[PDB]
């Protein structure tokens, strides 16, 4: 069986399911490449993981992201969270754990939201 890992990203009602499998850097969102993700203005947000850890690592994997729910902004945040978590999970399972540590450190250095859900749970005062 081809190596594959699965991850979820969530933001408000938006939920994104990412499958990361051995491949050739074929990355798609809802059956289309990333470059067509909308709104255009926030597209680089979805690019945040790709650019941080370098495109070289993605050159050996294919990522399929399927996203449902929420609005535009929450959809984008779900996408980026799903991509980051999937990349780290695959690097853990089928690559050295040293690269796993490097990936986690880079991501948590930039913005921890890529890895931990951002749940603004109510707090009474």
């Amino acid at each position: 069986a081809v190596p594959s890992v699965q991850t979820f990203g969530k933001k408000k009602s938006a939920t994104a399911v990412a499958h990361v499998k051995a491949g050739k850097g074929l990355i798609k969102v809802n059956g289309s490449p990333i470059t067509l993700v909308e709104p255009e203005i926030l597209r680089f947000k979805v690019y945040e993981p790709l650019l941080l850890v370098g495109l070289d690592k993605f050159s050996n994997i294919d990522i399929r992201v399927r996203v449902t729910g929420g609005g535009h902004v929450s959809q984008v945040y779900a996408i980026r969270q799903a991509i980051a978590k999937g990349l780290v999970a695959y690097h853990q399972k089928y690559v050295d754990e040293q690269s796993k540590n490097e990936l986690k450190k880079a991501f948590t250095s930039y913005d921890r939201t890529l890895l931990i859900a951002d749940s603004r749970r109510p707090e009474p005062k």
Binding site: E97, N101, K104, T108, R112, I116, S119, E123
Partner: protein
């Protein structure tokens, strides 16, 4: 319960309204507030030391509280739970505030930076995560699952490698300098990590006894038969005396009773670990007792900033030529105790205040450490007190600016 060591009187006792068992406690630096946590109430109780009244119950955790700690400087309270969360309570002040930070998995232990600026937490996943209190953002992470050595118990039916019994650290503590973490768990290893570079400085084996259950990863194949492990066979009846044959064991007990009750071999496990406030040593409580590891012996040659011209012969010549300041400095660069001790005792009293004001600041921590370890058991008390009077008067301002470097020495 609060104890006074001067008169050994239990000068006060606190108890919850709901009759709740307590597993973790923390004490304010001012010694005026005491907070305890429970594995049954999901809240942190608070009491005022002077009055004994239950000041308030802090709520907000959706799981049992596992560890607490106060910040020695900022006086905030950090509490962690099995809720996969950590909460920072600013109990003191006109306004109470709570700042939760989420974590990947269950939190078991917690350690507070002496500066009070960061907190480390050991998770069930086998991670030591360091967070910055004021910013509430992660600053580091250290993997620990691979380092932890865990053994196969005799009763177990699954390998130690596949075992998930104890691949996490149930206790951690900082070094007072703040650059090192010593960790221990329900396992056969005490690991010492270095915070700034997130690397394993050294690992220690707690025990090597086969009377304890968890010492060995791989157990001898010969011990089985078609029945099973030989050692699981109870041979108490072979004991000649009656008291050895009698079994008082309760079937399901795990802890909290005498050795006879549990019926199973003790398991190697480190409940707590701490660094010595005054010496470069740490103590780890285990089943066999408090194993105290120390660096006192110091047979290692750990020179600092040598050159070809520095040599044990040369420093003796610098002493004979009455170049004390050089002689003392070259003593530190070699960093040999017997050589330091000689140069320390040969400096005449008239020359101590001049030497002290001219010791390079970089070596100031070393001399203060040396005076401390030497003075406790040495006989030259007035000689030492003359030195310390000289050093503190000369370099008191520097010591003040960098407290957490000179804390253990001071």
């Amino acid at each position: 319960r609060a104890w006074d060591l001067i008169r050994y009187r239990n000068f006060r006792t606190f108890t919850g309204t709901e009759r709740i068992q307590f597993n973790c406690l923390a004490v304010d630096p001012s010694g005026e507030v005491v907070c305890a946590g429970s594995l049954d109430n999901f809240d942190i109780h608070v009491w005022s030391v002077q009055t004994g009244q239950l000041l308030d119950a802090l709520s907000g955790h959706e799981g049992p509280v596992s560890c607490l700690s106060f910040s020695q400087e900022n006086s905030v309270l950090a509490s962690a739970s099995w809720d996969k969360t950590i909460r920072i309570w600013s109990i003191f002040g006109r306004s109470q505030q709570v700042e939760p930070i989420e974590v990947y998995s269950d939190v078991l232990a917690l350690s507070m930076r002496p500066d009070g600026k960061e907190v480390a937490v050991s998770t069930l996943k086998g991670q030591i995560s360091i967070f910055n209190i004021e910013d509430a953002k992660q600053v580091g992470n250290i993997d620990c699952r691979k380092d932890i050595i865990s053994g196969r118990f005799n009763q177990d039916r699954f390998t130690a490698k596949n075992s998930e019994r104890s691949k996490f650290f149930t206790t951690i503590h900082y070094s007072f300098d703040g650059m090192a973490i010593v960790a221990g768990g329900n396992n056969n290893s005490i690991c010492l990590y270095d915070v700034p570079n997130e690397v394993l400085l050294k690992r220690f084996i707690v025990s090597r006894n086969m009377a304890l259950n968890g010492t060995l990863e791989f157990l001898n194949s010969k011990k089985m038969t078609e029945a099973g492990s030989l050692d699981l066979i109870d041979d108490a009846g072979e004991n000649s005396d009656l008291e050895d044959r009698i079994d008082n064991s309760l079937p399901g007990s795990q802890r909290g009773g005498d050795l006879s009750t549990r019926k199973m071999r003790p398991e190697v496990r480190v409940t707590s670990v701490q660094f010595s406030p005054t010496a470069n040593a740490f103590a780890a409580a285990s089943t066999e007792g408090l194993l105290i590891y120390s660096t006192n012996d110091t047979i290692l040659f750990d020179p600092f900033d040598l050159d070809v011209d520095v040599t044990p012969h040369s420093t003796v010549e610098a002493l004979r030529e009455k170049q004390f300041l050089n002689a003392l400095v070259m003593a530190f660069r070699l960093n040999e105790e017997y050589l330091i001790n000689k140069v320390y005792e040969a400096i005449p009293i008239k020359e101590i205040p001049l030497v002290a004001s001219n010791i390079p600041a970089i070596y100031l921590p070393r001399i203060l450490k040396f005076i401390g370890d030497f003075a406790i058991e040495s006989q030259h008390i007035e000689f030492n007190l003359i030195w310390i009077k000289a050093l503190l008067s000369a370099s008191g301002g520097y010591i003040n600016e960098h407290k957490y470097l000179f804390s253990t020495a001071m």
